[PDB]
Design a protein around this ligand. Structure first.
Ligand code: FAD
Ligand code: FAD
Ligand code: FAD
Ligand code: FAD
Ligand code: NAI
Ligand code: NAI
Ligand code: NAI
Ligand code: NAI
Lengths: 285, 285, 271, 265
């Protein structure tokens, strides 16, 4: 009865949203010939979905800044899509950052994901610095379950407001598996007067061990039912993929029904899962 | 809020049912060396799930009866699992059927899926004939959306009652995608005084074109959202598999919450999807 | 509540093209009603119903068959007729292309079914009463009679109109567990005139739910609102019935096509 | 227990003028809490809106609220107009911006003139020009904080959309009533045009329901009344006790819908 009809309604609603969802994909700089090939294969397949934009990460304190910039250029040259480099300020001086920013702008890179990076400058300072350089589109990190270093949930929330007030035109969340946490956070952002959309960062899980490691380092809660779902699958990649896709598809269906029309996917350079999740959202070639 | 909490509750409930679900798998006689290999690979993998039983189909009017019996023997000899041959009465005389039945019993085959088969004997007649031969475990076909040849839903329902009264100890449904139809049918079976469990026959869909063909021939309704879900995937087998697994997993989660503790899977000789669906039900090696 | 409504409406939209409908008419008593009736026939015919029937007549049936070609099934009662004449009329119909006959009493219906059977292989349709026929001594008794009529050869059963959906559903559940293997086709009475409808009800022992009485309260002089409210009630009823598996509907048009036509439209039954 | 309001538009032809007054007489018997009259910048102007408001008041004694926008109007002009309306007994105004001062600026301006009862527009499916859903919700809060006494929503056909929106409003601390604007549909072509211009979602089952009825007004009316009655029934079950009807100057449908809600003469 209830559970059945609820499913049908949720499913039909999702079907009718086709054509109204905006998506973006996050990639990281390949470290090997194999990953390089995989990445470009993924870029080609996901580019057909016409994402609002794609972004490329940059490991803070890595000194591999050139890799990020190189990938960004290649993406623009091959797809004509807007590619946003992630830029951290914890490992660079204001002068270096202004130089880096000016170069991006002159190279046609007009969207930057401004982050602080892990341990004189916090992300909000980078946002201001970037806005002084040029009228950049700026995306910043949001934490539904609170950044692990925040003094309080209130402080972390106020910090997001600070970043938006400084010029950030959108917020992208750390991944989460507790859907209610995201929804509650979205309401709190309204209460704090934040007027930008809080874009959910979605992590499709095929490798649970890896996800649990990411999660444990970021204070993200993995529900008991999810841990039980992946238990016993250490050596079953096929079942992990099916189970993970089911989880992600369930997640975006509920989010879509709650009015979310923008999704950012942590692809980890693989396209299969994100491509299928987008398919269910009506985002097709 | 609502949709979110409902998901969490459904998911947690499913997690807690681990160890209480009975499953069975249906296979068909391979027609080529390739399918033969695939089938035994699937048998080996699904056998580790300890199914209550497995069954092997027999195409009515095919004259390939020996193929079914051969596969059944091989399964018993290799796994030690109960293997139930499907037996049709539309293409054999009572004498031939009694002979066939006696041979099965003497060969250790004590469970038969008694069916009529497509066009002097209806399935109910076969049930009676089988019970006279020996004390067989007998499974019969049930149709939540009504068999296409029934004079009415009432007649088809009364026919199921006839089969049970004649000796059938369980009913297995034709596949369905409208979960409410199964639930309503289960309630009607109670109203008709049928005291056996109505086991849902689950069809995990990876090939939509094939499923639609099966469905159109059997009066099974494919919801509009499901047709839209597979639209545009004719040449994308990977996405079809992920989408189909999501549908099947959603289906058994809702069924499980409604008290269903028995599931029969139409594997079409492939194990991957059914194996993963069983994993979500807590049915693991 | 909201989601369930969305699910019900969608499932209804998908049943489009699989529901069978039939329309019941009555012989006109005036030139005006003659005009109205045939206009309805032309209108409702475009919906290609499984069949249409005329209360008891033979002429109207012929005209319908000659004008639309639809299976016109005339009603037949046991009153004012002898078994001899019955067989005569029965054979008179079958010999005129009339294959479907709604056997009614008005010497019971069962005997009428048996008689038509012993004459030819007609498609017999009898009456069913979800709220028990007023004359019947008991619910079970009237129930067994229906079975007797079905056993006698009644192909399908058509219920007296009703407004309490649960009553029809409970009755259908008792019909199956009673061994009746025919579909209990719900007879739908779209209400535009509450006074007239309440009259029929009090004459057939049909219950008018309190909510229905309240819904029509104060509309004696508001035909417009009555029609919208009645169409709504009939709409909701067939929607719920459809979700319960009912794929056959019989409409008591009272020779008017507007409402029945609209209700069919929502069931996917369109030209 | 349930309060209703009706919205009308200034007639532009003699035929529509007759229709409107017939509808006013019919609907006034239901004693609505108030009725409102829309404004068409290039389709009637403020004088026509005002004329109808005055006529309704004189003929029925009902509270009539003009829809007042601030496009191509100066603050001084708006103050002069509001003062005149107040002095003439018009004490409820539906304050709007109008398509391209924001509505919140008008609310403030009006409250400075007098203690007007003020209603503002709300969008369950977000105003088309809003930066985001969050920004549109914060704007509604700004309008309420500026003095708006209630919010009236753009029409919708996805009931859950309205329910989820109402919940977000409450979470945001918006304490006034979020009154659903109901559009009974008898002309689907016209409704779809309205919807396509305002980001309002039309469920698949609904589009399907009106398919093939382009030249069948009778069936459209019966089908649309069913949809509307179904909608208000669910909304009522969910705690809604105020409905605003987009009559499009016709009374039959809204009258019947109110009847089912127990709102009768
Ligand atoms: C969408 C997304 C993409 C990412 N991509 C990358 C990437 O490519 N490379 C990489 O290195 N990292 C990346 N990260 C990780 C990120 O850099 C870390 O989470 C980092 O520790 C914080 O960065 P931030 O931009 O959130 O910092 P901030 O917004 O500055 O927040 C960090 C902490 O400082 C606190 N804070 C802010 N201002 C003050 C103040 N004045 N005093 C005290 N505390 C204060 C905050 O509450 C918080 O606890 C990403 C995160 C997200 C969610
Ligand atoms: C779990 C499952 C497994 C199957 N496996 C196979 C297989 O291996 N091989 C194969 O050939 N087919 C198979 N089928 C398909 C099946 O044989 C067809 O659906 C067939 O047309 C009916 O078989 P049945 O056993 O349901 O027949 P029955 O139960 O006899 O029903 C068939 C029809 O006859 C009607 N009926 C019954 N008694 C009477 C009566 N006395 N008078 C009039 N009508 C009556 C019923 O209402 C129904 O419409 C399977 C179906 C299911 C659901
Ligand atoms: C679809 C429909 C169409 C109709 N069309 C017409 C029409 O065209 N013309 C017309 O004149 N009337 C018509 N009627 C009304 C009908 O004729 C009356 O309801 C009438 O009272 C007889 O009903 P019946 O045909 O069910 O007879 P029956 O089926 O014989 O049942 C009537 C009563 O007799 C009782 N009963 C049956 N057998 C016995 C027995 N052996 N001993 C004692 N009690 C017994 C039953 O329980 C019941 O109370 C229609 C009704 C319906 C529902
Ligand atoms: C009940 C109802 C009745 C209506 N009646 C009429 C009528 O009679 N005549 C007519 O012409 N129109 C009418 N409208 C249509 C309305 O005028 C349009 O929707 C118009 O485009 C916006 O009006 P508003 O009052 O909602 O403006 P606002 O509430 O000002 O909203 C308009 C947009 O501006 C945004 N916004 C608000 N403040 C700011 C800011 N400071 N910076 C940036 N963006 C901001 C909002 O989020 C929104 O996208 C009606 C609408 C409703 C729902
Ligand atoms: N939340 C996010 O989107 C990201 C967070 N980070 C954080 O910064 C640290 C340093 O980055 P790297 O030098 O690349 O470390 P790394 O080399 O371990 O990570 C490689 C890549 O994996 C992906 N990844 C890693 N952690 C992730 C996370 N928590 N969420 C989503 N994607 C993730 C990113 O694409 C990252 O570039 C990471 O260990 C992580 O803590 C880094 C990139 C993205
Ligand atoms: N419902 C069921 O479980 C089955 C139904 N059937 C019906 O009997 C007919 C004849 O059988 P075959 O000679 O094998 O035809 P076939 O050669 O086309 O089918 C081969 C196999 O595919 C699977 N299959 C086909 N239709 C199916 C269905 N509707 N549901 C679940 N599995 C299905 C069965 O394992 C079947 O043995 C089929 O076309 C079908 O209509 C046959 C087997 C199973
Ligand atoms: N339930 C039914 O389908 C029918 C019931 N009857 C009833 O049997 C008696 C004799 O019939 P008439 O001389 O035609 O009476 P009548 O002259 O009052 O009725 C004329 C026609 O209106 C329709 N009608 C009348 N009552 C109805 C009802 N309760 N339900 C559905 N349709 C109805 C029928 O088409 C009937 O032929 C009357 O009491 C009449 O109401 C007659 C025909 C059909
Ligand atoms: N949401 C509302 O209640 C209203 C919205 N508007 C919108 O403002 C803009 C300018 O208006 P006009 O030039 O008069 O357009 P128009 O000339 O197409 O509209 C004429 C009249 O029809 C009614 N109407 C039109 N759109 C409606 C809607 N979406 N919802 C309810 N009633 C509606 C109103 O009474 C309006 O005065 C248009 O986009 C129009 O849709 C105008 C009046 C009311």
């Amino acid at each position: 009865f209830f559970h059945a009809s609820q499913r049908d309604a949720l499913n039909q609603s999702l079907a009718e949203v086709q054509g109204q969802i905006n998506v973006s994909f996050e990639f990281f700089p390949p470290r090997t010939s194999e990953m390089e090939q995989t990445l470009w294969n993924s870029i080609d397949r996901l580019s057909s979905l016409k994402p609002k934009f794609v972004s490329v990460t940059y490991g803070a304190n890595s000194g591999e800044r050139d890799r990020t910039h190189s990938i960004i250029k290649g993406i623009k040259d091959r797809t004509g899509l807007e590619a946003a480099p992630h830029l951290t300020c914890i490992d660079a001086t204001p002068d270096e950052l202004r130089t880096i920013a000016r170069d991006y702008w002159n190279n046609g890179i007009r969207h930057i994901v401004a982050l602080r990076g892990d341990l004189e400058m916090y992300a909000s300072d980078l946002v201001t610095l970037l806005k002084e350089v040029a009228d950049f589109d700026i995306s910043v990190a949001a934490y539904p379950e609170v950044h692990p270093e925040a003094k309080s949930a209130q402080a972390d929330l106020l910090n997001l407001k600070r970043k938006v007030d400084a010029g950030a035109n959108r917020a992208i969340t750390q991944f989460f598996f507790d859907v209610e946490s995201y929804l509650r956070f979205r309401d709190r952002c309204v209460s704090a007067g934040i007027d930008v959309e809080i874009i959910p960062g979605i992590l499709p899980v095929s490798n649970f061990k890896q996800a649990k490691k990411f999660a444990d380092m970021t204070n993200v809660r993995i529900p008991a039912w999810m841990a039980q779902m992946f238990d016993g699958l250490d050596d079953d990649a096929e079942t992990r993929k099916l189970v993970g896709a089911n989880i992600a598809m369930d997640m975006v269906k509920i989010l879509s029904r709650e009015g979310v029309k923008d999704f950012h996917f942590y692809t980890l350079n693989r396209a299969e899962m994100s491509y299928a999740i987008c398919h269910t959202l009506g985002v097709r070639p």
